[PDB]
Amino acid sequence: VQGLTEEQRMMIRELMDAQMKTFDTTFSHFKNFRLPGVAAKWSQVRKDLCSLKVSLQLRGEDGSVWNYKPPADSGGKEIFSLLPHMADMSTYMFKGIISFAKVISYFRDLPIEDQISLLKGAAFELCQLRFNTVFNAETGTWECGRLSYCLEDTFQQLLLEPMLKFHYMLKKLQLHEEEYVLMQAISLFSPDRPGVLQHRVVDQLQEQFAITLKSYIECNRPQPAHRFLFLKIMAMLTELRSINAQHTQRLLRIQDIHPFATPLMQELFGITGS
Ligand SMILES: CC(C)(C)c1nc(-c2cccc(NS(=O)(=O)c3c(F)cccc3F)c2F)c(-c2ccnc(N)n2)s1
Numbered sequence: 217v218q219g220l221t222e223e224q225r226m227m228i229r230e231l232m233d234a235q236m237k238t239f240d241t242t243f244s245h246f247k248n249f250r251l252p253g254v255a256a257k258w259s260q261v262r263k264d265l266c267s268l269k270v271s272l273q274l275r276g277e278d279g280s281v282w283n284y285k286p287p288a289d290s291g292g293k294e295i296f297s298l299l300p301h302m303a304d305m306s307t308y309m310f311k312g313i314i315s316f317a318k319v320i321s322y323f324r325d326l327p328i329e330d331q332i333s334l335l336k337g338a339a340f341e342l343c344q345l346r347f348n349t350v351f352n353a354e355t356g357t358w359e360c361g362r363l364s365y366c367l368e369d370t371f372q373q374l375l376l377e378p379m380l381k382f383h384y385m386l387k388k389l390q391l392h393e394e395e396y397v398l399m400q401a402i403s404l405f406s407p408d409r410p411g412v413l414q415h416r417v418v419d420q421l422q423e424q425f426a427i428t429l430k431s432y433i434e435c436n437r438p439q440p441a442h443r444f445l446f447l448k449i450m451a452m453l454t455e456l457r458s459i460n461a462q463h464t465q466r467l468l469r470i471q472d473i474h475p476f477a478t479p480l481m482q483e484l485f486g487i488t489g490s
Contacts, residue, residue, distance in 0.1 A: 219435025219436075220428065220432060220435060224427075224428045228397075228428060230322075231320065234319040234320050235393070237315070237319055238312050241349075243360045243361035244361060246305065246360070246361070250300035250303075251272075251284070252298055252300075260469060261469055261473055262289060264466045264469055265470065268380070270298070270367055271284060271286065271365070271368055272284040272301070272364070273364040273365075273366065274362055274364075286368065296476070299476040303476050303477060306478075306481060307478045309343045309346065310484060311480070312346070313335070313339050314339070316342065316400070317334070317335055322401075323404065326414060326417070330414050333410065334405065334409055335484070338404045338409065339484050340460045341403045341456050341457065344379070344459070345396060345399055345400050346396075347383070348386045348387060348396075349393075351387050353384055353388070367380070378455070382452070382456060386452055389449070395429065395433070399449060399452075399453060401422075402425045402426055403453055403456065405418050405421045406418070406457075407422060426450070429446060430446045433445050433446045434446075
């Protein structure tokens with residue numbers, strides 16, 4: 217509303233427009249995805265994979281329901297059964313993220329080589345930000361339209377896994393749509409991603425997205441619960457970058473022993489094909 221400059225309001229409008237056009241919140245176009253079948257190293261890969269045990273539910277348009285419960289680790293390959301499905305979901309999410317960036321004027325004006333570097337740097341993080349908006353913290357469930365992913369009761373022991381503590385702590389802030397898309401912009405325009413050339417312009421763009429966020433919070437959120445909301449959000453973005461670097465290493469480890477990354481995932485994670 218008011219309290220923001222015209223450039224700031226236009227900035228938020230452009231991000232909201234881009235989010236509206238490229239985030240399929242009902243996941244209606246996520247289709248033809250794979251499903252789990254009807255050294256050590258392997259030790260590290262086994263703990264890498266048992267962190268996020270999730271059950272899966274699919275509600276058919278006709279009213280039927282399929283439910284999938286994963287196996288326990290039995291020292292064998294059953295730990296890989298969800299990877300093809302998660303790869304297809306990640307790939308679907310990444311395409312929406314790429315379309316989000318491409319619709320935004322500030323991003324489209326950078327050199328293409330820096331566009332690519334920025335997308336490689338932040339695709340994971342924008343994916344997690346979008347998933348948080350469909351996260352139900354009461355049921356521990358990501359509600360993706362006809363699909364649901366539910367954490368398997370194994371509990372603050374779950375809040376020990378950094379991605380999961382991230383989703384609960386971010387949901388707790390009860391952000392608006394505008395604050396989520398500003399979080400996405402700040403993360404997308406990070407001057408320090410590997411291989412970025414235009415450090416100073418990306419940093420100025422980022423600073424302007426951060427300032428718009430701080431001003432949006434100050435003019436629209438006077439309640440004592442939202443004191444320091446801006447700084448809490450920025451601490452969450454720092455944590456999410458840390459989560460990004462751990463899960464990049466985790467993906468490359470799993471990929472080393474059990475290949476699964478899609479071609480789009482390989483491009484974003486720097487896998488060359490040889
Ligand atoms: C749908 C739901 C339940 C919320 C999930 N999303 C992701 C998730 C979130 C963000 C990005 C990617 N895909 S990814 O390509 O970034 C990636 C993997 F697919 C696998 C391992 C690491 C990794 F970074 C994801 F799979 C999940 C995820 C993330 C990392 N590892 C595992 N095993 N699952 S689980």
